[PDB]
Amino acid sequence: IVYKPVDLSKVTSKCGSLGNIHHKPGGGQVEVKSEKLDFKDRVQSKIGSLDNITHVPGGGNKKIETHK
């Protein structure tokens, strides 16, 4: 079997300026009041007003390759 794929591709971006960005995620109020819960198997729990992810990359380009 011959497996010889060729990749000469390019991912490119030009940004003259990136900025004057104001990000103000709002919190909010959270309340949790459990009483008589029973767990017969494993548990994962998250509690919180704000979960925030912010990306401001100058590039931020993504290339994914997979061969099998």
Binding footprint of its own copies on the chain (CB under 8 A): 1-68
Rg (CA), the chain: 23
What is the rounded distance in angstroms from the CA atom of residue 11 to the CA atom of residue 28?
40
For the bound state, the minimum distance from the C-beta of residue 63 to its own copies, rounded and expressed in Å, comes to 5
**Contact predicate 56/21, CB 8 Å:** yes
For the bound state, the minimum distance from the C-beta of residue 55 to its own copies, rounded and expressed in Å, comes to 5
For the bound state, the minimum distance from the C-beta of residue 34 to its own copies, rounded and expressed in Å, comes to 5
